């Protein structure tokens, strides 16, 4: 789909916000992954529970359903981080994707 | 000078890191401003003391000399935020600029 272009420079920190509608008492895992192929997106970080300090190296997610969005943070950008990414939201019931946004990160 | 290009989309949050060398026990105010002309840069936010929650609406700065850099955060980007900006570092002694980095923010 038409990737939204994000651009920064090496050493900086990237912040990406992805909003989503309410699903009641049910919790949807949030994920950030990098496209490796048209049909492979490698998971970089995932929020499994709400308002958790979801770590994993340079990548983190802070998700709060009460706010209606989660924020992905990528620190210490390198040229090699350039590429296509998606923030994805997964359903409990079957891990199907209910919302996904494609981004093109350009780091120079 | 050759502005570094930062690019995002409306609604997102922008993070800008500016590093700087040590000045001992002396504290340099940190500022973020937007170019209005070649010789006018309007101050948007300033850190007057170290590790302070330097507010002022959508813009904030967190500066920590022990870390060697400060971070400017601009939330809720709008198309109108597009333009040239500088993160500046001011000397005690006379408010002269000891370091400044020019950026071009593109928000679509």
CATH number at residue A106: 2.60.40.10
- Count of domains forming chain B: 1
Name the nearest CA neighbour of A62 among A4, A18, A12. Answer: A18
Residue A74, min C-alpha distance to chain B (Å): 11
Q: Which long-range contacts (CB under 8 A, 24 or more apart) does A61-70 make?
A: A61/A30, A61/A31, A61/A32, A63/A30, A65/A22, A65/A23, A65/A27, A68/A19, A68/A20, A68/A21, A68/A22, A69/A17, A69/A18, A69/A19, A69/A20, A70/A17, A70/A18, A70/A20, A70/A30
Phi, psi (rounded to 5 degrees) for A81 = -80, -10
| Distance in angstroms (rounded) separating the CA atoms of residues A8 and A74 | 11
Give resolution in angstroms. 2.2
Residue A94, min C-alpha distance to chain B (Å): 30
- Residue A87: give the domain boundaries: 1-108
Contact across the interface for B12 and A8, Cβ inside 8 Å: no
Method for this entry:
X-ray
């Amino acid at each position: 789909s038409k990737a939204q272009v994000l651009q920064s420079v090496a050493g900086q920190t990237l912040t990406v916000r992805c909003q989503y509608p309410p699903t009641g008492s049910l919790y949807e895992k949030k994920g950030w992954c990098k496209e490796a192929s048209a049909l492979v997106c490698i998971r970089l970080v995932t929020s499994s529970k709400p308002r958790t300090m979801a770590w994993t190296s340079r990548f983190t997610i802070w998700d709060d359903p009460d706010a209606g969005f989660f924020t992905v943070t990528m620190t210490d950008l390198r040229e090699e981080d350039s590429g296509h990414y998606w923030c994805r939201i997964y359903r409990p019931s079957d891990n199907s994707v209910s919302k996904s946004v494609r981004f093109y990160l350009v780091v120079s």
